[PDB]
Ligand binder design. Structure first.
Ligand SMILES: CCCCCCCC/C=C\CCCCCCCC(=O)OC[C@H](COP(=O)(O)O[C@@H]1[C@H](O)[C@H](O)[C@@H](OP(=O)(O)O)[C@H](OP(=O)(O)O)[C@H]1O)OC(=O)CCCCCCC/C=C\CCCCCCCC
Ligand SMILES: CCCCCCCC/C=C\CCCCCCCC(=O)OC[C@H](COP(=O)(O)O[C@@H]1[C@H](O)[C@H](O)[C@@H](OP(=O)(O)O)[C@H](OP(=O)(O)O)[C@H]1O)OC(=O)CCCCCCC/C=C\CCCCCCCC
Ligand SMILES: CCCCCCCC/C=C\CCCCCCCC(=O)OC[C@H](COP(=O)(O)O[C@@H]1[C@H](O)[C@H](O)[C@@H](OP(=O)(O)O)[C@H](OP(=O)(O)O)[C@H]1O)OC(=O)CCCCCCC/C=C\CCCCCCCC
Ligand SMILES: CCCCCCCC/C=C\CCCCCCCC(=O)OC[C@H](COP(=O)(O)O[C@@H]1[C@H](O)[C@H](O)[C@@H](OP(=O)(O)O)[C@H](OP(=O)(O)O)[C@H]1O)OC(=O)CCCCCCC/C=C\CCCCCCCC
Ligand SMILES: [Ca+2]
Ligand SMILES: [Ca+2]
Lengths: 144, 39, 331, 331, 99, 39, 37
C-alpha cells in the first residue's frame, strides 16, 4: 500500500484542474462530461452525498482515500452482490440462462454496451449450458 | 326551504373532497408502465 | 411525434403538479354547474338559474366537444392502436363511450331547446362527474374484490333473499286483513309485505308498515335477527377484501422498485471488474475513479431498495430466523 | 433549572399517581360546569343556574389564565425551544392554540356581560373538554390510520357519493309531484330528495320522507342495498386499522425494553472479564464478588426482556423452527 | 357533545308540522344526538331548519363511523381469544402424551 | 321534562368514564422520551 | 416426460391471494444454498 498512497493524490485533485485539495464535485460534472458521461445535477449531488463521508463536497481525501480503501472483495460486500442474483432467481439453484442474463443485462438499471454484455456471460457459461451460476461469477468478482 | 341551499352545497362538497383526493392520488402516482412488471 | 405523445400523457393517465390542477378544476366546474342545476328545483331559489347558466352550459359543451377530439387525435401515441382504423378500439374504452354519450347527447338536447327540455340537462350534467375520474382505478378494485369473494357473496345473498322471500310471506298471511291505528290497511298486497321485507332486512325501519297482529310480530322478530346477520355480512367481507388488495399492490410496487436497483449493482460491479481493457492511457486513468464512485451510489440504492419495506414491522415471525441460518452458513 | 423542568413534566406529558388526580379533577370540574350549563336550557330546571355559577365561571377563567402562563413559563426546559423568542413555536402546538382561544375568548365574553350574552359561555364551556386530554395521543392514531388507508376510503366514499348523487335524482324524477297521506308533498325539490339520499344511505331511516309512487320504491330498493354496503365499509376498514396500529406500537415498545437489557449484559460481561487490572490489593478482592453478583441480575433481566412477548402465543408458525436450526448448528 | 349543541343553536325556536317544538332544551337535542349517533333514527325529532340538517349530515357520517367501530374491534378480539385457548388446550394434551 | 336531568347526567358521565380511562392510560404510561427509540 | 415436467411446475408455481410468500421470501433459498455447500 506504500507505493500507491502518493501518486493517487495526483489523480485526486486532477478534476479541479488546479493544485487545491478539492474533490471538486462542481467540476466533476464537467470532468465526467468531458470523459463522455454528462449526468444530471441530481445524480451528481448524489455522488459525493455517499462518496464523501465528510459532507462538504470537496475533500483532501478523508473518504476519497477510504473509497480507494474499500476493496469491495471481502465478505462484507460479497453477499450483497450475491443477493442481486437472488432477485432474478426462479426455481432456485441460480438457474440463470444466457438468454435471460442477456435479457436482464441490456434492459434495466444502467445498461452495458452490446460488446460488453455479449462477452460478459462468456466466462460464466464455460460449459455452454443454460445456467450461468452466481458462484462462477462472484469467483470472477472475487478479485473485484 | 329557508336555508335549503346548505344541504346541496355540503353533500356536493364532501363528494368534491373525495374525488379531489382520488385525482391527487392518481397524479402523485409514480409511473404508468402497463406491462413491464414481471419481465 | 413529441407533441402528440405529450398531449396524451397530459389528458390521459396524467402526471405532474399542473395536470392535477387542470383535471380537478374541470371537475370543480362540473360540480358548481350541477349544484346550480339542482338548486333550480327548490321553487324559491329558482330565480338564480337564469339564461347565463344555459350559455355557460353551451360553452361547456363547446369545450368538451373539442376536448374529446383532442384526446382522440392524441391517441396515436399508443402501441395498442395506431392511425385512424386502429383508434376505434380506443373508443371501446367505456369511459370514452360514456364521454361521447355525454357530449353528443347534451349537444343534441341543447340544440332542440334553442330553436321537459331543461330537465334533460340535469341527468347529462350529473353524468359529467364520472368522466373526469380517469383510468378507472376505483372500479377495477371493486370488480376484482367482488370476483375474488364471489362464493361468500352469492351464498349470503342467496340465504338472505330466501329468508326475505319466505318469511315476508308468512307476515302477509298473518296480516292480510288488519287495519292501522288511522283506518288504513298496511299489508294489503304481497308487494307491501315485501317492501317491508327489504326495508326490515336492511335495518332501515322507516315505520310506515309495522305488523299489528301479534302473530306477525313474532315472525318479524325471528326473521329480523336471522336475516339482519346475513345482510350485514358483505360489509365485513368487502372490508377484508379491500384492505387485502391494496397490500397486494404494495408488494408488487415495492418489487418493481427492487429490480432496477438489483440491476444497477450487478451491471456496475461488472464495470468495476472490467478495468483491464474497455495516447489512450490517461483516459483510462480517469475511469477507475468513476467506476468506483458510482458503484457506491448503486450500493446505497440497493440497500434502500430492500430495507424500507413499506405495516413495516412484518419481520415478527422471522426475527432470529434470517440470522440463525447465516451464522450457521458461515461455519 | 430543577423547578421549571419539574413543573413542565407535571403540567404537560404528566406522570405519577398525583398528576392523574390533578388533570382528571380539572376535567371533572369542567364536566360539572358544562352539565349545569346545558341544564340552564330546560325551562323548568333553569332556576338552578344562578349567578354563583357565573362567579364560578369567572374564578375558573382566573384559574386557567394563570394555568396557561405557568405552562408557558415552564416551557423553557425543552431542547426544541428556549428563552422567549423560541417559545412562540411552543404556541404553535394546536392544543395550546385551542387553550389560548378558550381562556381569552371566555374572558372577553365574561367582561362584556358584566358591565345572547350567557349563550356564548356554552360553546366556550364545551371547548374546555378538549384541552385536558393532553399529548394528542388519540388524534395521532386516527390521522395515521386514515392516511394509511387513504386508497380504500377515497374509493368507497367516491362510489357511495356517486350512487347517492345519481340514484337520489331518479327518485326525484319519479316523485316530483305526488302528495303524502296528510296532504303535503315530500320530494318537493332536489334537496329534499338528497336529504333522503343521505338519510337512507346511512341506514337511519327517519320516516319523514318515504317514496310513495311504485317506481321510486324500486329505485330506493336498488340504491339501498348497493350503497348501504359501500357506506358500511369504513367501519370494518378502520376496525382493522386501529387494531393493527396498537399492535405495531406493542412491538417497538417491547423492542425499546429489549435494548437496555441487551446492553446491561454485554457491558457487565466485559466488566466480569476485566478482573486482571481495573495497599491496592484487598480493594480488588471485593470487586470480584460484585462483578459476578450483578452479572446474574443482568442475566435475569435479559431473559425477562425476550421471553415475555406481549397475544403472547405468536410462536405458532415457528414452533419447531427455532430449535431445528440450533440442533443442526450443534452438529 | 359538540355537534348536538350546534343543532340546538340552529333549532332552539322552531315548531313541528303538528304545533310542538322538538328541540326545546339541550337534553332533547342530546337525546337526538345519542339516537342519531347510533343509527336508530326513531323519527320523533328531525331538525326542521335547513341549517340544522347540514350539521346533522356532517355529524351523522363522521360519528356513525366512530360508533360502529367497536363491533369490528370486539369481533376480531373474540375470535382471537378462542384461538388462543385452542392453542393451550392442545398443548395441555401434548404434554402427557410426550411423557 | 319531569326527569330530564337524567339524560344529560348519563351522557356526560359516560363521556367522563372514557376521558378518565384516557388520562389513566397516559399517566400510567412509562416514559416520554421522544427521539431515543432507534438509536 | 417433459410434458409431465411442465405439468408439475404448473402444479406448484401458480399458488392461488397469490402473494403469500411474504414471510419466507429469502428463507426458501437460504436453506438450499446452505445445503449445496
Ligand atoms: C363497464 C365495465 C368496464 C369494462 C372495461 C372493458 C375494457 O376493456 O376496459 C379496458 C380499460 C383498461 O384496459 P387495461 O387492459 O386495464 O389497460 C391498462 C389501462 O387501463 C389502459 O387500458 C391503458 O392505459 P391508458 O391509455 O388507459 O392510460 C393500458 O393499455 P391496455 O388497455 O392496452 O392494456 C393499460 O395500462 O378500462 C378502463 O380504463 C376502466 C374500466 C372500468 C371503468 C369505468 C366503468 C364505467 C362506468 C361504471 C358506472 C356505472 C354506474 C355506477 C353507479 C350508479
Ligand atoms: C345469472 C348468472 C350470471 C353468471 C355470471 C355473472 C358474473 O359475471 O358474476 C361474477 C361474480 C360471480 O361469479 P360466477 O358467475 O358465480 O362464477 C365465475 C364467473 O363466471 C367468472 O366469469 C368465471 O371466470 P372466467 O371463466 O369468465 O374467466 C369463473 O370461472 P373460474 O372459477 O374457473 O375462474 C366463475 O367461477 O359476481 C359475484 O361475485 C356476484 C356478487 C353479486 C351478486 C348478486 C347481486
Ligand atoms: C381536495 C384534495 C385534497 C388532497 C389532500 C387531502 C389530504 O391530506 O388527504 C389525506 C388523505 C388522502 O391522501 P391523498 O391526498 O389522497 O394523497 C396522499 C396525501 O397527499 C399525502 O399528503 C401525501 O404525502 P406527503 O407527500 O404530503 O408526505 C401522499 O403522498 P405519498 O403517496 O407519496 O406518500 C399522498 O398519496 O386523507 C384520506 O385518506 C381521505 C379520507 C377521508 C376522505 C373524505 C372525507
Ligand atoms: C390540528 C391538527 C394537528 C396538527 C399538529 C401539528 C403539530 O406540529 O403538532 C405537533 C404536536 C406534537 O409534536 P411531535 O412532533 O409529535 O412531538 C412529540 C410530542 O407530541 C410533543 O411535540 C413533544 O412532547 P411534549 O412536550 O408535547 O410532551 C415532543 O417534541 P417535538 O414536538 O419537538 O417532536 C415529541 O415527543 O401535536 C400534538 O401535540 C397533538 C396534535 C394533534 C392534537 C390535537 C388536535 C386538536 C383538535 C382537533 C379537534 C377538532 C374537532 C373534533 C371533533 C368535532
Ligand atoms: Ca473546490
Ligand atoms: Ca467534505
Amino acid at each position: 500500500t506504500e507505493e500507491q498512497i502518493a501518486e493517487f493524490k495526483e489523480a485526486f485533485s486532477l478534476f479541479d484542474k488546479d493544485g487545491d485539495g478539492t474533490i471538486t464535485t462542481k467540476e466533476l460534472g464537467t470532468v465526467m462530461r468531458s470523459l463522455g458521461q454528462n449526468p444530471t445535477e441530481a445524480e451528481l449531488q448524489d455522488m459525493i452525498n455517499e462518496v464523501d463521508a465528510d459532507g462538504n463536497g470537496t475533500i483532501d481525501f478523508p473518504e476519497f482515500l477510504t473509497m480507494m480503501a474499500r476493496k469491495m472483495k471481502d465478505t462484507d460486500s460479497e453477499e450483497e452482490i450475491r443477493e442481486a442474483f437472488r432477485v432474478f432467481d426462479k426455481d432456485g439453484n441460480g438457474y440463470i440462462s444466457a438468454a435471460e442474463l442477456r435479457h436482464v443485462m441490456t434492459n434495466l438499471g444502467e445498461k452495458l454496451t452490446d460488446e460488453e454484455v455479449d462477452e460478459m456471460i462468456r466466462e460464466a457459461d464455460i460449459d455452454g449450458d443454460g445456467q450461468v451460476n452466481y458462484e462462477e461469477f462472484v469467483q470472477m468478482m472475487t478479485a473485484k | 326551504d329557508d336555508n335549503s341551499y346548505m344541504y346541496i352545497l355540503f353533500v356536493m362538497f364532501l363528494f368534491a373532497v373525495t374525488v379531489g383526493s382520488l385525482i391527487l392520488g392518481y397524479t402523485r402516482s409514480r409511473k404508468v408502465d402497463k406491462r413491464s412488471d414481471p419481465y | 411525434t413529441h407533441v402528440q405523445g405529450r398531449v396524451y400523457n397530459f389528458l390521459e393517465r396524467p402526471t405532474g403538479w399542473k395536470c392535477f390542477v387542470y383535471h380537478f378544476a374541470v371537475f370543480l366546474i362540473v360540480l358548481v354547474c350541477l349544484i346550480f342545476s339542482v338548486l333550480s328545483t327548490i321553487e324559491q331559489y329558482a330565480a338564480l338559474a337564469t339564461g347565463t347558466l344555459f350559455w355557460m352550459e353551451i360553452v361547456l359543451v363547446v369545450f368538451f366537444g373539442t376536448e374529446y377530439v383532442v384526446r382522440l387525435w392524441s391517441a396515436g401515441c399508443r402501441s395498442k392502436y395506431v392511425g385512424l382504423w386502429g383508434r376505434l378500439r380506443f373508443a371501446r374504452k367505456p369511459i370514452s363511450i360514456i364521454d361521447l354519450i355525454v357530449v353528443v347527447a347534451s349537444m343534441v338536447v341543447l340544440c332542440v331547446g334553442s330553436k321537459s327540455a331543461i330537465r334533460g340537462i340535469r341527468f347529462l350534467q350529473i353524468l359529467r362527474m364520472l368522466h373526469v375520474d380517469r383510468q378507472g382505478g376505483t372500479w377495477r378494485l371493486l370488480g376484482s374484490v367482488v370476483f375474488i369473494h364471489r362464493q361468500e357473496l352469492i351464498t349470503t345473498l342467496y340465504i338472505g333473499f330466501l329468508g326475505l322471500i319466505f318469511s315476508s310471506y308468512f307476515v302477509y298471511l298473518a296480516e292480510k286483513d288488519a287495519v292501522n291505528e288511522s283506518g288504513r290497511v298496511e299489508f294489503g298486497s304481497y308487494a307491501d309485505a315485501l317492501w317491508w321485507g327489504v326495508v326490515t332486512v336492511t335495518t332501515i325501519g322507516y315505520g310506515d308498515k309495522v305488523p299489528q297482529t301479534w302473530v306477525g310480530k313474532t315472525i318479524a322478530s325471528c326473521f329480523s335477527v336471522f336475516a339482519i346477520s346475513f345482510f350485514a355480512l358483505p360489509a365485513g367481507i368487502l372490508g377484508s377484501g379491500f384492505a387485502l388488495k391494496v397490500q397486494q399492490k404494495q408488494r408488487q410496487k415495492h418489487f418493481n422498485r427492487q429490480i432496477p436497483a438489483a440491476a444497477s449493482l450487478i451491471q456496475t460491479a461488472w464495470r468495476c471488474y472490467a478495468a483491464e481493457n474497455p495516447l489512450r492511457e490517461h483516459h483510462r486513468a480517469t475511469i477507475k475513479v468513476i467506476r468506483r464512485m458510482q458503484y457506491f451510489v448503486a450500493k446505497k440504492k440497493f440497500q434502500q431498495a430492500r430495507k424500507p419495506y413499506d405495516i413495516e414491522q412484518y419481520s415478527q415471525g422471522h426475527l432470529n430466523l434470517m440470522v440463525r441460518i447465516k451464522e450457521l452458513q458461515r461455519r
